[PDB]
Amino acid sequence: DTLLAVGNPADLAVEAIRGLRTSLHFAMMEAKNNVLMISGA
Amino acid sequence: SEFLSGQAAAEMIIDKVEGGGFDYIGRGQIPPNPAELLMHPRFEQLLNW
């Protein structure tokens, strides 16, 4: 019951999530606050 | 890697190519967090210098 980012940081999904982190560092600047809501469809 | 993690100097990492006539900086030892070392301010400091 551990996070994939910690259990296997070299995983392909964690690499995609790191790319997501870098893209959100750019999308979330010029935003109201540092709150990021994530919702499924 | 050694420079970014802090255990090397800005000058200890540069090596002259023998037949190329330019300097290079190698990757060092493969780090466990390559993406997060490259996020360190040391990378931009090295580039500015």
Task: Please state, in angstroms and rounded to a whole number, the distance separating the CA atoms of residues A34 and A2.
Answer: 26
Read off φ and ψ for residue B46, nearest 5 degrees. -60, -45
Phi-psi region of B14 (alpha: psi -120 to 50; beta: other; left: phi over 0): beta
- Residue in chain B lying closest to A18 (CA): B35
Using CA atoms, how far apart are residues B15 and B43, in angstroms rounded to an integer? 17
Interface membership of B45 toward A (CB under 8 Å): no
Q: Determine which helix (DSSP H) or strand (DSSP E) holds B23, and give its type and residue range.
A: strand B23-25
Burial of A18 from C-beta contacts in 10 A (0-12 / 13-18 / 19+): middle
**Residue B12: closest CA among B1, B34, B47:** B1
| Solving technique | cryo-EM
Task: Enumerate the residues of chain B whose CB falls inside 8 A of the CB of residue A18.
Answer: 35
Interface contact A9, partner B, CB < 8 A: yes
Residues ≥6 apart with Cβ < 8 Å to A18: B35
Interchain CB distance below 8 Å, B33 and A18: no
Phi-psi region of B8 (alpha: psi -120 to 50; beta: other; left: phi over 0): beta
